[PDB]
């Protein structure tokens, strides 16, 4: 409805690393529910299992902790113990080659998952189409 329907090729069979081209960080969910990015490919918190709820709608779950990636009412990204409406993301292709993740709940506001150059997660309203922060590359684990 609010967005296009260009989808990336299937990547749910195996777990993946979500590499942000912005600052070259791997998305990470820490045990305490903290979300950020790290350049350390050896980190035990950067592996995710993605799954499709509906076509183009996914859950992003940490294989290490079982936490679900989510974005709160104030646009803050966090790790959820249980899956909820804040956990659904619209997985879309971007710039013909990357994957972008739009908060389903806040889709009309164009709130995306994104990482700054310093490895910090961006707040929902600070994200927008056109930024490098929103571009991810699913990499093999």
**Nearest-angstrom CA–CA distance, 2 and 43:** 36
Instruction: Name the binding residues for heparin.
Output: 22
Residue 33, token pair as written in the block = 């529910």
Instruction: Name the binding residues.
Output: 22
Q: Which of 55, 20, 51, 13 is CA-nearest to residue 37? A: 20
126 backbone dihedrals φ, ψ, rounded to 5°: -85, -10
Burial class from Cβ neighbours inside 10 Å (0-12, 13-18, 19+) for residue 23 reads: middle
What's the gap between Cα 48 and its chain centre?
10
């Amino acid at each position: 409805h609010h967005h296009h329907f260009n989808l990336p090729p299937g990547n749910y069979k195996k777990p993946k690393l979500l590499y942000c081209s912005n600052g070259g960080h791997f998305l990470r969910i820490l045990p305490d529910g903290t979300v950020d990015g790290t350049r350390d490919r050896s980190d035990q918190h950067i592996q995710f299992q993605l799954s499709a709820e509906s076509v183009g709608e996914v859950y992003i779950k940490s294989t290490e902790t079982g936490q679900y990636l989510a974005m709160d009412t104030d646009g803050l990204v966090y790790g959820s113990q249980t899956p909820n409406e804040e956990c659904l993301f619209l997985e879309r292709l971007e710039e013909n080659h990357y994957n972008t993740y739009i908060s389903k709940k806040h889709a009309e506001k164009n709130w995306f998952l994104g990482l700054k150059k310093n490895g910090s997660c961006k707040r929902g309203p600070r994200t927008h189409y056109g930024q490098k922060a929103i571009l991810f590359l699913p990499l093999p684990v």
